[PDB]
Amino acid sequence: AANDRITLPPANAQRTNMTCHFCIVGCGYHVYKWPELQEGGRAPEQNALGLDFRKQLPPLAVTLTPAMTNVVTEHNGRRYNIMVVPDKACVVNSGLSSTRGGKMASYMYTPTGDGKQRLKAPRLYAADQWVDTTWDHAMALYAGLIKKTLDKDGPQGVFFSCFDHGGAGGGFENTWGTGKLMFSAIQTPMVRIHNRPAYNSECHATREMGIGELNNAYEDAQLADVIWSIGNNPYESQTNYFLNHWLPNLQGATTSKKKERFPNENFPQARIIFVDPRETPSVAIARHVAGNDRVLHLAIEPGTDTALFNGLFTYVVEQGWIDKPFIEAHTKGFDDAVKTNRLSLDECSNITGVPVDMLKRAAEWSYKPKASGQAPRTMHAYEKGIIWGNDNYVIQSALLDLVIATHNVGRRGTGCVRMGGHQEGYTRPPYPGDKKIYIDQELIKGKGRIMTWWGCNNFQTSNNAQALREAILQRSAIVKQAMQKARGATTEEMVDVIYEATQNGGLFVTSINLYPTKLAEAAHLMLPAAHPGEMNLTSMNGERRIRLSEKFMDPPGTAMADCLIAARIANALRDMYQKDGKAEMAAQFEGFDWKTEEDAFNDGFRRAGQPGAPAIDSQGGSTGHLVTYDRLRKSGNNGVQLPVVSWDESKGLVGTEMLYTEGKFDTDDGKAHFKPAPWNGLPATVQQQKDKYRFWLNNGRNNEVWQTAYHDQYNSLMQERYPMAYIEMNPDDCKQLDVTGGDIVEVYNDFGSTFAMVYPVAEIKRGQTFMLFGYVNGIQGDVTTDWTDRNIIPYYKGTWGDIRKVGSMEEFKRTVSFKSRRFA
Amino acid sequence: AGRTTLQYPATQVSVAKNLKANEPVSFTYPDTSSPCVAVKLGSPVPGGVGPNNDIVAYSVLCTHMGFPTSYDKSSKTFKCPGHFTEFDAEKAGQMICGQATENLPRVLLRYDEASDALTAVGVDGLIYGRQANVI
Amino acid sequence: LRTTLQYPATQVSVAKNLKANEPVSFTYPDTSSPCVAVKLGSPVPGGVGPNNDIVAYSVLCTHMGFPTSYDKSSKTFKCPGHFTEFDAEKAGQMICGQATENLPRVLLRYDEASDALTAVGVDGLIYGRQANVI
Amino acid sequence: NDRITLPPANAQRTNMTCHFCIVGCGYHVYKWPELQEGGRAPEQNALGLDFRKQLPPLAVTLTPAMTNVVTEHNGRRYNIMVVPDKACVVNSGLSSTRGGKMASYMYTPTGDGKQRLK
Amino acid sequence: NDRITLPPANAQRTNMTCHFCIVGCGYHVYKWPELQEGGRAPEQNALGLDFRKQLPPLAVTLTPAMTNVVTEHNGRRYNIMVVPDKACVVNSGLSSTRGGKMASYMYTPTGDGKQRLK
């Protein structure tokens, strides 16, 4: 109630720092907290915002809506106003909030709000019904099973899919806690990652070539002559990096800063190049801002990125638009890559479908020396269009070859970088196996006794998701059936019942989450976790800027920080082993004496590379010990860019702006290494789909929707806007199928069947479509194939299928806008 | 003391029959610092007023960061030049795409058949850059 | 050809880490040249940063080269050798002493975008050097 | 002496009419930080002239008298170069001996303008 | 500015008592053609000081104020450097701020002595 006013924060309101929960950008926010029955005055010095609400505010004065406010109820029963607003003086966002960040207040836990279905206690499926259980019963059952599996099968029987990421449901405390548990204690290799079905990297090729994927600053996007966005929709997917850094460059606001840095270098008007089969909102908005003459949309054929980059690499080499002194001093393998990667512009154009003039123009803008003699400063930004593209490893090989030859790493205004997805916050022991293992396939084939989903939901986000759900629901059913013959069994008897069920095909499933989710259809056990603001949390953004998000409120019920869940599990296991007289096995579960999340930070991030530390892989590096929570507090939302170079009381944390500025790469010899990039067409499994069925089933992000819609599903505005996952279709394709906006279609192939509401989109090419991924109503991933590259990276953007009209949803027609999301 | 509602003014905008289909009229509501548009859409919509139940009215300040939006007659949307938010005039200010976390505020119109008058009498939603719709 | 010295660009810190009247030590343009940057707390001509108040100096006395010490109470650099004192608020002006040159100023770029302070040059000649860049 | 600091390609350039006689010849004033300079390559300096080899007659009017170092109210030092505009219709790049000295006769604390009333 | 021309090893060296106060501190005046200079190695300059690396405290008294370029009656230009004598018993290499300025207060056409009666 009350749509037409807001309670201002009092001048003396409490104010903590909070990094945005969601995307890689890591925008800075402030959380104002104050007693419910107090308020600020409208006069600027009588409210905490310092803004004058006695008369209308001018544009850009504030970002403040009711969605940015809430009233929380704490463990003491007392009620507090909260206001979650962007920080004007944070360098990342300069006071910008995205629609996703902007809802943080609404998506904090309250008993009556959008967070009202938060998990507040252990949930147990007791054979035939959901009930609450105690933490100690949950641990006895879960630890008990794990212990039984270790004793009988070894670690190979214990499976996880876990976040490896930063931000909310990740971060340095959390990745350490989980990783220590999985790898040092349990010592299971049967672990996948939240977004991919093995224990691997998105960036094997670029790393192996010596270029870690987050090698620049956001300021580099301000200094660039040319930005490439490759398989990337950054207005929607990395909003405030695009808005606060890219667009000011395209508008000429950063020209004077380029000239001040480089007094004897021409800086033309900045240009942008998109490699994306689809015409996205980002393409449209770039055209609106910069003009059609400063945007090149290389609208490639799906999966032809490798051909594109081999053709551009061939061309820049033949023109001599390369850095020969750089190649000679700082690289290995160039001459070989020229041979293996050779492709003419005509061949490139036939494969990609991009005209030769556009290929030449992209090279001219990006690599041909400026009048003043210097190569253009070209930042090459890529994301999931190529990471989940046609052979992840080969595309990065091709792209990095182009970048290295043109010296577009290590110079300011350059970088070949991930745009990123989540924030980053990785500190973990090494992976304890010697093999990549395709975990979903293992599960489908009936391996494993216990599977834990931790801070992910592969029912909505696996590749080949329908095969996965089928297998897991059936295996879960076997355990359910076995449990319900028990009456009056002790916990230990129940452990034996369940374990026996898993010898007959069953699988015990645990989810550690904020919410039930669709995993509740299969899970036997669900544990409540806590998100940032309910806990302290550290993470870094796409330029490696580490920030502390401060606790300001209690979790719901007995919800706990995931690192502390991991400690709880470890301590339960240790106790069981100690009781069973197994001192060596107990010893593996030592080192989780943690009372708060800070303890996990001290044990992981701050120990990396230190004397008497075990092997630790940390994005903080060996100077991570210089970071403390207190020092990050003093740093504000600006934090420090990792790695930290120095600290003292008078200077604060001093860090690292750009990687590779002296030409020393992360390889044995200090050189960047070129790689061969063969063009082999589409994978046979994908090509088979394309040969059988009509439409390319592209997929990915919507600006407004975050991920699997775990919060968004409970937001009445979001559900009114997107009550179902939508599929962008060409209008002429639509007419042929007798569909229009708000019709429902089935989308289907050999891999599965799913459902979407029709969204006619003039910019979609005939025989192409675009479906929202990961959603709560119509899961896209059912039609993705099982195909992965050499390191088990899926081609999620590589699938084809047919489309069938179900019928017209009149209510969608009455309430959902099918107007264009490409601004002009 | 007591009152839970804001004291909205009653401000005459026009008579309904003076509005042409898809030709926006400008006015201020609830004071001269709050620019608004009323438009006859030409086809009935939920909550439209006037003889053809098709007249709607909005605050034009973007609910993201407050730039005056512009009515596009060809799409019947309000487009913000600041961060490219677009609102649907035919779906009660629903955000088509953008960075806002609130729909475009609706100006509530009374339509009197007796006089043909449209009177602004309230706002549904919070106008950008205001503690309350009524300052 | 070239008439200018090739100064390095050296990161000092971000401006917002500096506390008013608490000197930060760094070396510029090499590790044998000790420098201080201080936020004065009040704008001064040619101060950098959000409040135009950050200044930086070579601390080697321009008399005979002893490291000077920043006095927080006067905002000066004092030399223990022959008692020269320089004003940090007047671009190294000699208040009293035996030097014939003001205390050299380290020229800082301040980038609003990053909040970085970068040492990019020196105004004045550092003690006991033929050129500021050796 | 025997060298000049070139204006960097991105040097600030303002318009100045000669201080002195009726003719009103057009000049450009290049201003840049003291510790920066242009390259000799024509695209790496503000004049657009090729100082990697001898220039031919009429290519420039440039002497040390047409250069100075000013100290601004902020204490910061800036190179200036005050040279005739080749595309001004009045003078077509000509400078008289009088206008040619304008740089020298700008105020600096140590130069020809040192005794300026302050 | 930010550099100094070193006296060559073979530069002319004369004795000079300070112009000013009673103490009568001893100095050396180094004089040499404008287009020559000393090297940084201690045996390649007249000071015998090692300018290949930072000098320690008390090693020298040397600023730009202690240097000048004089124009002689023959029109030829000469670097001068007026610096305290380390082996003088009076001052043991000390220079006051007043005597330290002697080079600057020598007569040159463009310097501090420009208004000398001629």
Ligand SMILES: Nc1nc2c(c(=O)[nH]1)N[C@H]1C(S)=C(S)[C@@H](COP(=O)(O)OP(=O)(O)OC[C@H]3O[C@@H](n4cnc5c(=O)[nH]c(N)nc54)[C@H](O)[C@@H]3O)O[C@H]1N2
């Ligand atoms: N609004 C919002 N933002 C988010 C997220 C969110 O859920 N919602 N999620 C975050 C996460 S975890 C991630 S991973 C990022 C992902 O951000 P992006 O990778 O930017 O987003 P996607 O929509 O997955 O894919 C980008 C583009 O890949 C194109 N594409 C498809 N096939 C190919 C191909 O073969 N080659 C090329 N070159 N392009 C192709 C698609 O048309 C699409 O526009 O977004 C992050 N930001």
Ligand SMILES: Nc1nc2c(c(=O)[nH]1)N[C@H]1C(S)=C(S)[C@@H](COP(=O)(O)OP(=O)(O)OC[C@H]3O[C@@H](n4cnc5c(=O)[nH]c(N)nc54)[C@H](O)[C@@H]3O)O[C@H]1N2
């Ligand atoms: N077809 C197709 N499939 C894709 C993609 C695509 O482009 N196309 N994108 C892939 C990408 S890049 C990604 S990132 C993955 C995403 O796959 P997921 O990781 O499976 O989905 P998310 O929504 O990020 O999952 C986060 C989950 O953790 C919960 N959560 C939130 N905060 C916390 C917390 O503090 N603790 C814990 N324990 N749980 C928490 C949420 O409620 C939610 O269930 O999907 C992948 N799947």
Ligand code: F3S
């Ligand atoms: S507000 Fe949040 S969603 Fe990304 S653009 Fe900024 S981190």
Ligand code: F3S
């Ligand atoms: S004195 Fe006269 S001739 Fe020209 S350069 Fe000056 S206007």
Ligand code: F3S
């Ligand atoms: S002023 Fe006196 S102290 Fe020495 S340098 Fe000159 S005699």
Ligand code: FES
């Ligand atoms: S101010 Fe309107 S979209 Fe941001």
Ligand code: FES
């Ligand atoms: S050495 Fe500093 S006053 Fe003499």
Ligand SMILES: [Mo+4]
């Ligand atoms: Mo992702």
Ligand code: NA
């Ligand atoms: Na039962």
Ligand SMILES: [O]
């Ligand atoms: O991701």
